[PDB]
C-alpha cells in the first residue's frame, strides 16, 4: 500500500489500537476508583466498629 | 496471510481480553459500592 495511515489495513490496525487504548484507560480508571472507595470503606468501618 | 493480518488478529484477541477484564472490573466496582452503601446505612442506624 502507498496510502500510508489511511490504507485499509492500517486504519483497521489504528482503530483496534485506539479502542484497546480506551479500554486500558477505562481499566486504570476503574482501579483508581476501586482503591479510592476501598479507602473510604475502611474509614467508615472504623467509625462503625467505634459506634457499634 | 501477511504480518499485517497477524497484527490485526493479535489486536482483536487483545481487544476481546480487555473487554472481559473491564466487565470484571465494572462488576467488582458495583459489588463494592453496594457494600459501601449498605455499610453507610448501618452507620446511620448505629449513630
Amino acid at each position: 500500500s502507498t496510502m500510508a495511515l489511511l490504507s485499509q489495513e492500517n486504519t483497521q490496525i489504528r482503530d483496534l489500537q485506539q479502542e484497546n487504548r480506551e479500554l486500558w484507560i477505562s481499566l486504570e480508571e476503574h482501579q483508581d476508583a476501586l482503591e479510592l472507595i476501598m479507602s473510604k470503606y475502611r474509614k467508615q468501618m472504623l467509625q462503625l466498629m467505634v459506634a457499634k | 496471510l501477511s504480518q499485517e493480518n497477524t497484527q490485526i488478529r493479535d489486536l482483536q484477541q487483545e481487544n476481546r481480553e480487555l473487554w472481559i477484564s473491564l466487565e470484571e472490573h465494572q462488576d467488582a466496582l458495583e459489588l463494592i459500592m453496594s457494600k459501601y452503601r449498605k455499610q453507610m446505612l448501618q452507620l446511620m442506624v448505629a449513630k
Partner: peptide, 19 residues
C-alpha cells in the same frame, strides 16, 4: 497479564463477599 483478578478478589473479600 490478567493477574488483576487477585486484587479484585482481595477487595471483594475485604468487604465481605465469599467464594
Amino acid at each position: 497479564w490478567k493477574q488483576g483478578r487477585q486484587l479484585l478478589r482481595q477487595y471483594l473479600q475485604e468487604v465481605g463477599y465469599t467464594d
